[model samples]
Target: SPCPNNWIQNRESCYYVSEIWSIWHTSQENCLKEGSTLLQIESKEEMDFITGSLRKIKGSYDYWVGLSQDGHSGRWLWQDGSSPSPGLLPAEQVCGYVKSNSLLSSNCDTWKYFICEKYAL
Candidate 1:
């Protein structure tokens, strides 16, 4: 089936890049309301697609993704509990965001644009 209105499709997934800025927690909440989840880069192709799409947006803005540090291990993990690329994140931040091909670290409370993802219906 097709994606929801205003959502863009690539392969088996549909993506929604939010125009409104929000903190990481709030961004995930918004995505959940749409029956989707905040962006989670699972593959190089997915990453390429997301970065390419973001490139169309002017300026250098970071986007919230579904990645954060575990409280116990201090290890970065995606929403699904998978580990992020080794040494890609900084020790200072608990949240992750897309910046070009790099996944930068930041405070979870900072407001920013976000991307939501869901399988195409």
Candidate 2:
């Protein structure tokens, strides 16, 4: 089946880049309401594709993803339970966000655009 309007399909997933912005936790909640999840981009190719889409947005804003660190768990974790790439994350910045090809950390309450991914029928 075709992806919904405003959603872009690639292979099995349909991706949505939000027009409206939300905080990190709110962004995840919004995706769950849509039956998707804040994207846990697990590979370089996926990151390239996703960030490529984000480039169209003006300025240097970051986009939230599913990877994050817990207040206690020393290691970062993806919402999908996959191993996370813990590169350049701030010690206190527990939320995972992407700016172009770089992965950075953000406060959980920071407002920004985000990407969501769900399986396309």
Candidate 3:
């Protein structure tokens, strides 16, 4: 399916205006199947952009992002295996979905949907 107008494509990445709510493990698997991963927000600009886009969606709920500690445990890491920059979520709060409003840490076994970000390059 094509992305909505509210969604913006940055290189291989696709940002959705809708909140992607899913458990950590399931979300990761979904992204992998799509040849991508959950979004790993880098800067405030990116974060703001995502939140702005999500504003068009109705209701408020935590969405699954790219950061998680499912595999290694305790060490929060991005799906790309790259370390998060200074402004990203903290280690203690790692894992699960994160919306513009809040972040929720849940088990990976839980079933849920999530956003997938593919690298165009």
Give the local distance difference test score of model 3.
0.61
- The sequence of per-residue lDDT tens digits that candidate 2 reaches over residues 35-120 is 99998776667777776777776766777888788788656788887776544443444788887767877777878888899988
Better of 2 and 3 by TM-score: 2
Writing each residue's lDDT as its tens digit, candidate 1 over 18-95 gives 989999999999999999999888777888888898888786687899999876887888898887665446435578
Once model 2 is optimally superposed onto the true structure by TM-score, how far is the C-alpha of residue 31 displaced, in angstroms?
Answer: 0.5
Q: What is the lDDT of residue 22 in candidate 3?
A: 57
Best by lDDT: 1
Clash count of each predicted structure: 0, 0, 1
Could you tell me the TM-score of candidate 1?
0.89
Tell me the tens digit of each residue's lDDT in model 3 across 1-121.
2443444676446755334545666666766765566777767776776667666666555667777764556766676687766567553434656555444565665644566665454
Badly placed stretches (over 4 Å) of model 2 are 86-93
Clash pairs, candidate 1, are: none
Q: List the residue pairs that clash in candidate 2.
A: none
Error of 3 at 8 (Å): 3.5
RMSD to true structure for each model, in Å: 2.1, 2.4, 4.0
